[PDB]
């Protein structure tokens, strides 16, 4: 009752979220950088941390 199965979906989802925290941080940084008027969401998000 106190021990819990953490299977492949949950561990991979946690790792993916741990990655996603980095890329939202970078997006937040560059999005807080201004002149957003001509910008597209391929250079704010970077697939390398994910």
């Amino acid at each position: 009752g106190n021990r819990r199965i953490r299977s492949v979906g949950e561990m991979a989802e946690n790792q993916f979220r741990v990655g996603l925290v980095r890329v939202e941080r970078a997006v937040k940084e560059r999005l807080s950088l201004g002149d957003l008027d001509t910008l597209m969401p391929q250079d704010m998000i970077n697939a390398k941390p994910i």
Binding site: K28, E29, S32, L33, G34
Partner: protein, 50 residues
């Protein structure tokens, strides 16, 4: 900072920056570098720091 002043009158300087976390650490440490050393005759000190 050099072109303001040049006179008896007090010259205010305004360093508009992004948000302090949003500014990169290079820009940050440059900013408290210039902010820590506001002195008349501090240029060669800044050049030696460069």
């Amino acid at each position: 900072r050099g072109r303001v002043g040049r006179s008896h009158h007090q010259a205010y300087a305004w360093l508009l920056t992004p948000h302090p976390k949003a500014m990169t650490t290079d820009a940050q440490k440059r900013l408290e570098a210039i902010a820590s050393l506001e002195d008349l005759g501090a240029g060669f000190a800044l050049a030696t720091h460069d």
